[PDB]
Amino acid sequence: PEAVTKTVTIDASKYETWQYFSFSKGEVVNVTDYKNDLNWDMALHRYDVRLNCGESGKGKGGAVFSGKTEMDQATTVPTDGYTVDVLGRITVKYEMGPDGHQMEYEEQGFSEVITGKKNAQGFASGGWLEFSHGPAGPTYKLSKRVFFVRGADGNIAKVQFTDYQDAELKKGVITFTYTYPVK
Amino acid sequence: PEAVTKTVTIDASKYETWQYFSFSKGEVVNVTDYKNDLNWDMALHRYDVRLNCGESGKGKGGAVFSGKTEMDQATTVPTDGYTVDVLGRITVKYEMGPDGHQMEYEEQGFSEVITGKKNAQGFASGGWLEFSHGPAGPTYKLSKRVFFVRGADGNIAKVQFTDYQDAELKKGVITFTYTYPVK
């Protein structure tokens, strides 16, 4: 199989569910027992990313950071050391308005490599999306970190996330480009 | 009056109230009608800072950033341009439950110069404290920015905030040093 590149946007704005994605199909797929299903490679929920490995599934998944922020510079693919998913805090319900919010969370599996490591309130650093500071107030910045990501069957995608909101600034609409399979 | 320097720690961990402080007295003072009370100069709430001016009070207060991060470098005191408090989102209740929480907000006066400008999720930038990237997860970091701050009567303090939590990591326990009055 030759390396195919696709740019994908997925609406992961809902808090209650994840959007499951197949590298080989290039499509969102329906998943009803994610921990025992090899038909998905990566899942998205808000700014969280899950892989089919570790605490999130029974597959051969995992992820590394290439050290690059340009996909065209990440040309050597590692053969080992694809860190697997761990448990962390996921927001599963969020009600908000001008006067307050109420939220609920669950401990679930996710990829710290891609998501970043979370603080006690679930905000993350070191992955695809970072807090950024400037005089107009803090924003999210795309880190542009380029990941290598094993899918459920172990074949590797090169993945870079490039947006976290749509053109109307609806948050949790995620865009990424991936090239798959690579070796 | 000669310039006096004091290091102060105030427990501003409660969400429901502000801690009001007098520069001249070097002490916390009790305040109810804060918008009509010249006996306070600076108030603390969590990581928020309020001055007796603008949307927060009828006084002659306000603030500037000196451009310095060392108090001993901020030796020329501006005579004009002390920005006054504006309205923004203040968290006035936080209630934890076993698997989630609830927060309530109010729009109140605060100093953007010292607090930082807030985004739509309430994170501030450009003031004394910034929620920021790190390899173990995101954390608040001290900017060490040195401010000049007019009190209610217009007399100026040099102020630098140097901690946001106590030794047990209790959040919202604020340490600052100030020198007052300066000209």
Numbering used by the authors:
A (entry chain F), B (entry chain A): 34 to 216
Article, verbatim:
P. gingivalis is a heme auxotroph, therefore it must acquire this compound to survive and cause efficient infection establishment. Amongst well-characterized heme acquisition systems of P. gingivalis is that encoded by the hmu operon, comprising HmuR, a typical TonB-dependent receptor involved in heme transport across the outer membrane, HmuY, a heme-binding protein, and four proteins with unknown function. The work presented here substantially extends our knowledge of P. gingivalis HmuY by presenting data on further structural characterization of this protein and novel data on a second member of P. gingivalis HmuY-like family, Tfo produced by T. forsythia. The comparative analyses of HmuY homologs suggest that not only the HmuY hemophore-like protein of P. gingivalis, but also T. forsythia Tfo may be engaged in heme acquisition.
Our crystallographic studies have revealed a unique β-fold in the HmuY–heme protein structure and confirmed bis-histidine heme ligation. To further characterize P. gingivalis HmuY, we successfully solved its 3D structure in apo-form. Compared with holo-HmuY, one can see the opening up of the heme-binding pocket in the apo-form. The loop containing the axial heme ligand, His166, has moved significantly and the His166 side chain faces the surface of the apo-protein (the His166NE2 atom is shifted from the heme by approximately 16 Å). This loop must close up when the heme group enters the pocket. The opening up of the heme-binding pocket observed in the crystal structure of apo-protein was reproduced by MD. We experimentally verified that heme binding was accompanied by a movement of the loop carrying the His166 residue. Previously, using UV-visible spectroscopy with a single beam spectrophotometer, we estimated the Kd of heme binding under oxidizing conditions to the HmuY protein to be approximately 0.25 × 10−8 M. Here we carried out a more thorough analysis using a double-beam instrument and found that HmuY binds heme with Kd value < 10−9 M. We demonstrated that P. gingivalis HmuY not only binds free heme, but can wrest heme from methemoglobin directly and thus functions similar to typical secreted hemophores, which are engaged in heme transfer from the host hemoproteins to the outer membrane receptors.
